[PDB]
Amino acid sequence: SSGRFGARYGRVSRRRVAEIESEMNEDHACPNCGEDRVDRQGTGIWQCSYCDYKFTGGSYKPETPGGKTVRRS
Amino acid sequence: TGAGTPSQGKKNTTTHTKCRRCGEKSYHTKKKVCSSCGFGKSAKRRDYEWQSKAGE
Amino acid sequence: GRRIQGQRRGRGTSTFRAPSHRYKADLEHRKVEDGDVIAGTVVDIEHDPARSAPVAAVEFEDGDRRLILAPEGVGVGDELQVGVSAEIAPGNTLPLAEIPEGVPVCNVESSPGDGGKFARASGVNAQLLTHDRNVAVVKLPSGEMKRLDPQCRATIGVVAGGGRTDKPFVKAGNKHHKMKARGTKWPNVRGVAMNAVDHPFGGGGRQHPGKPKSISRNAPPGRKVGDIASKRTGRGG
RNA sequence: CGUGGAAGUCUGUUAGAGUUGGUGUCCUACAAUACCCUCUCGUGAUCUAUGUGUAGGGGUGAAAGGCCCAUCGAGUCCGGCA
RNA sequence: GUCGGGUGAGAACCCCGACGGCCUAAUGGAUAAGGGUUCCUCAGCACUGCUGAUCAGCUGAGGGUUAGCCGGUCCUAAGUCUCACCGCAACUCGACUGAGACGAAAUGGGAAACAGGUUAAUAUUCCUGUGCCAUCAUGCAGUGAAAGUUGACGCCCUGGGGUCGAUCACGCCGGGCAUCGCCCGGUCGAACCGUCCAACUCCGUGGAAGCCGUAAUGGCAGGAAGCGGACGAACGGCGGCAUAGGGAAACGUGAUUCAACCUGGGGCCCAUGAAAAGACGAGCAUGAUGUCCGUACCGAGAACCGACACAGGUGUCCAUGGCGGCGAAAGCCAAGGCCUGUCGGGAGCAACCAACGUUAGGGAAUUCGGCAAGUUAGUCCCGUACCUUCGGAAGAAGGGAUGCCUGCUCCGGAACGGAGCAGGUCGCAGUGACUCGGAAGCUCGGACUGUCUAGUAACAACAUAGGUGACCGCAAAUCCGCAAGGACUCGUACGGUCACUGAAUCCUGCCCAGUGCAGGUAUCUGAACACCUCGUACAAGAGGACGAAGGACCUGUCAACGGCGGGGGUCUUAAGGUAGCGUAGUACCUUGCCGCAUCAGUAGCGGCUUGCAUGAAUGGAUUAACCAGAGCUUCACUGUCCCAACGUUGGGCCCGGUGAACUGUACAUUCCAGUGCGGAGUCUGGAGACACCCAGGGGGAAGCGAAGACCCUAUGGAGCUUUACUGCAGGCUGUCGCUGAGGACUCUCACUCCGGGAGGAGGACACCGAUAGCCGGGCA
RNA sequence: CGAGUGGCUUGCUACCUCGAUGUCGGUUCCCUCCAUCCUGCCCGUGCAGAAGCGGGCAAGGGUGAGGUUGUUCGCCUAUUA
RNA sequence: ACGACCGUAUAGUACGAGAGGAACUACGGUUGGUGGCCACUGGUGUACCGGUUGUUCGAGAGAGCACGUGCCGGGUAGCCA
Ligand SMILES: COc1ccc(C[C@H]2NC[C@H](O)[C@H]2OC(C)=O)cc1
Ligand SMILES: [Cl-]
Ligand SMILES: [Cl-]
Ligand SMILES: [Cl-]
Ligand SMILES: [K+]
Ligand SMILES: [Mg+2]
Ligand SMILES: [Mg+2]
Ligand SMILES: [Mg+2]
Ligand SMILES: [Mg+2]
Ligand SMILES: [Mg+2]
Ligand SMILES: [Mg+2]
Ligand SMILES: [Mg+2]
Ligand SMILES: [Mg+2]
Ligand SMILES: [Mg+2]
Ligand SMILES: [Mg+2]
Ligand SMILES: [Mg+2]
Ligand SMILES: [Mg+2]
Ligand SMILES: [Mg+2]
Ligand SMILES: [Mg+2]
Ligand SMILES: [Mg+2]
């Protein structure tokens, strides 16, 4: 996904951007319904194209490992 | 770019203008203060002892 | 010599100031008398230029439209409650006394009613541990055990925008854009690359500091550079 | 295979910005930093106008002791001063 | 520029005509700033004008700028000021907090104007026609009225609507050309009023289990398509405006591609892309009012800044004129502008110089070095290595094609769009000019884009992402202020401060003795106040007791300053150099030795390598990609060279006019020798020497230009450093005051902080004032 | 071992110039010296010849092209009387 | 204003066991330098003639511009090596 970076920057810098942007562009399950229609609107801002539910999540993930710990207690 | 002749070409800004108080072309239209009589800065007229030789 | 960069900072000139006129809101907790009967609906989720994390727009029962420090999971339509008898749900603000032990909390107050000081950055959280009639022990994001007044308010959940530090900036331009939204002079020229006149580490035929880097706490501004009062340096040992 | 159209991405005297070599021309100059060809950048940490801020042991400085009105390893003016 | 002509006392350069040229993002059009009358007219030539002048931006005298609807004015932006408050010895000084005001003329927001006519000079301002806005008054309607909407918004890609323009087709009007019958121009008509509505959104119907849809993404039983409907755009269409205006005339119609303008879809952010006034919401008639300021002209190779009529510098809009082509490219040409990048005349016009063309054979032999020049070149097809971070390398390399003419095919709705086929055919040459890469390899450096010495350094230097260490829980760390106060901070450890290293990959050894920092500390040392002894009718003073930080001492720490040897089969001073790399941009010896390559190679590359004096974030090694960075090799090319020639343009030379400067103790026609403070046109001896003038290239005048930058000297200066001398800020710490009640402790009432408040936290501490000790190139 | 000549190297001195006599190497253009490398004429020879070695007179003319290196110097190549 | 060299004949000779191997003299040429000249060869030749690309003058004809010839081909005199 880091083909835009060309022959520049190096492995680790463009491998970590490719991995993070791959998981960001993925089909995510919505907290309102159950559909795989959540897209990123900006830094930390997520929204479902189905029910128009705009929510807060991680910067690049819609759910962080720490955000899932909150539900437990 | 040279600091001399080619840098003089950009000089079309008006700063020092005719003062309402003293009549000298020293009223800075951006600072709103006169460099000659001190209009805009002080009620008292700008004067200094160094404007003349010490014993005069 | 000449005053160092750290001394130019304090003067508070344009170059060193934060673009305050471009900032949205000072995210503080709402002021309630007692009774808890203050709740609101989340209207929008906005980007906050001050902290690079998202912020939630909430419209309260008494007609007050204020931006609040958004925890993770808070979305449009959701109802948030602020007060003593508030529900123990993520996104609600209640004093540390009413919040159960072992629950991740954010935007914690130092002194009761200050509006929140601790655990506000992207994805961080404070952990409430021990309870008492006098003290509420909270474990801050640095790992420090902070003894606080149980009357200090806090919001349940971790702060939104988690994992921001995970992705590299890759290029200088990305750093440039972030820095233009902060109160920092960037790029950073090393003192060792400067002249003797400009910095304690300046000068020489080759680049190296002129004395050891570990400076005393008692050092005056102009000399306090490098490793400030270091207990140790290095990785090993 | 196509679609898509990313990029401190490439070519480019587009506009614009910059200034490598010629150690060419000039060197009582057209010019107290100019001319010509050549050359670099040209969607970005880009360029630019106007307005606005920071002032002299002080600013400002991607740091060359660079720049702060042809003035800088401490501006300029007058005074100390004959 | 040239030939005629005009005016004039006078004409190369003032004016008319013709012919010939120049400018095309400008040499055209409109403007901002800035200038300030430079604008127009008349009269002039003493001044100014690179010559001349009858001309003029010159001299003199007159004249010239007309606004409800174009700016200003109003609003608010970064931010500024004033007042109050507070500080300060004090203020014309100073941060905060309040209130007020100021802050946008091209280019932020914003009530309303269009078309034509007119002057020597103004013009959406005057005049004609038409229109529009606001306020107020009267009348009618209305009692709604403020919720909401608008003002009002980033970057990238893109669809749809659509005007001007451009082009095509055909018709009409006018012109041009004259083998043809082609070519050029025109064919007009606003604001405004009215009306139409695509996109988006929504409603009803419908009932898709696979269909609907796009350039693309996409949409749906949470209800798809289809059908009906609500809301709803243009600076656009349409009608009026218009027996208005304009044109000599005709006074068109259709189309394509479509700037403006309108309206959607998509993607990006560790970046989130103003505010306020105002408007809408919220009708209509008639009438009144609409003041004040700007308005000329230039806007540049002569109206601005640069002392100049300066080859410099200086913002915006016209980015859609034609051919050309990918093109806002070249070249050529319109519209418009100009012959003022303002001295001319003459000589085949010599030498010499600047720019430049062409040179046979050789082909880098030139030189520090291919510096300079040249070679290559557009487009299509074939084809393409090592290495690599798999992106790239790559337009690698190499090979072929390329025009015109006739007739056609395919894609598309179509283009005056694109891709091909067959036949014919011309030249030395078909990207025919123009436009337009020379290619390959080895090594060094820095990873990359970026930054820099305005004016001799663009680089390997700075920056960078990335790596790392340090400080700090926010009444913080760091920093500014004398103070009142302030930045960081609308910030809170995924933060931000202070430093080092400098992408990725593989790694980053050993040393804490010294120095630095930090922690600890029985004991030692450690100031002042208070306390005790002596002394003094008191005081000075002497001693003691207690003992803070600090020091001694101990420990931790090197991705902290740094270190990693001599000797022998330990010693200094802690350790004794590990991976690697290595004759290095680090190797003195040194052109090290061997090999490659060349006829020959102090070069370059590889290997070896005992390294004068490599080595691991003072980072070591390595490395794809990138580079106006340093070195080397090859192919190609060539006037760099052998070795120079001829030519072209501007000078140079002669003539008219204009007209400086540098320099000057005097004398001066010198030459060879000598002498002399040892580097003489001038002294001595000889030699030579008739005067003046033109052109030349620069041998001499230790030529001209600058009170030597080097070096030394001066009880000269400045910047910089430090364990130099002496001090000054600052930090830490004790003590006294503020400061209170019952060697450890409780409390609350000062005081501080949090809270809107109630009240909460803290608390005689802290802050502050004073003093004492320690640290203290931060500063003098 | 002794005696000298030169003024190209180096060193020494501090006379001249610090109100300035522009550096090294190279280049280009001119003149000169002889202690002669070649060429002319000679003497000797461990001179058969050929090719040399050594010496004398002699400055008319000539003494060139290249590879490394900024180099002067020097090393190297092929030509050359 | 000439310097120098190579070659042929002398001669496979003198000399010498052989190997090897001269000279006087007479000739031909080369090289460097020098002065002059252009029939010949070569260069130039923005005199001139032709071809041809783009654009403008409507086409044609005939022309302008494309840096002081648009480019390409040929090239007289002169000047030159
Ligand atoms: C090579 O090193 C050099 C040293 C000094 C000089 C100059 C001096 N030489 C003659 C005079 O003493 C002086 O002349 C000047 C100053 O013009 C030149 C070169
Ligand atoms: Cl950051
Ligand atoms: Cl105006
Ligand atoms: Cl669309
Ligand atoms: K001197
Ligand atoms: Mg806040
Ligand atoms: Mg900033
Ligand atoms: Mg840096
Ligand atoms: Mg430096
Ligand atoms: Mg210092
Ligand atoms: Mg370094
Ligand atoms: Mg270093
Ligand atoms: Mg500015
Ligand atoms: Mg320096
Ligand atoms: Mg007149
Ligand atoms: Mg006019
Ligand atoms: Mg002029
Ligand atoms: Mg040739
Ligand atoms: Mg040579
Ligand atoms: Mg070159």
Ligand SMILES: [Mg+2]
């Ligand atoms: Mg078709």
Ligand SMILES: [Mg+2]
């Ligand atoms: Mg090297």
Ligand SMILES: [Mg+2]
């Ligand atoms: Mg670089």
Ligand SMILES: [Mg+2]
């Ligand atoms: Mg570096």
Ligand SMILES: [Mg+2]
């Ligand atoms: Mg420079």
Ligand SMILES: [Mg+2]
């Ligand atoms: Mg550069």
Ligand SMILES: [Mg+2]
């Ligand atoms: Mg870093």
Ligand SMILES: [Mg+2]
């Ligand atoms: Mg870091």
Ligand SMILES: [Mg+2]
């Ligand atoms: Mg080697």
Ligand SMILES: [Mg+2]
């Ligand atoms: Mg180490």
Ligand SMILES: [Mg+2]
């Ligand atoms: Mg002197």
Ligand SMILES: [Mg+2]
């Ligand atoms: Mg010196």
Ligand SMILES: [Mg+2]
């Ligand atoms: Mg001094």
Ligand SMILES: [Mg+2]
């Ligand atoms: Mg307070």
Ligand SMILES: [Mg+2]
């Ligand atoms: Mg000092």
Ligand SMILES: [Mg+2]
């Ligand atoms: Mg001289």
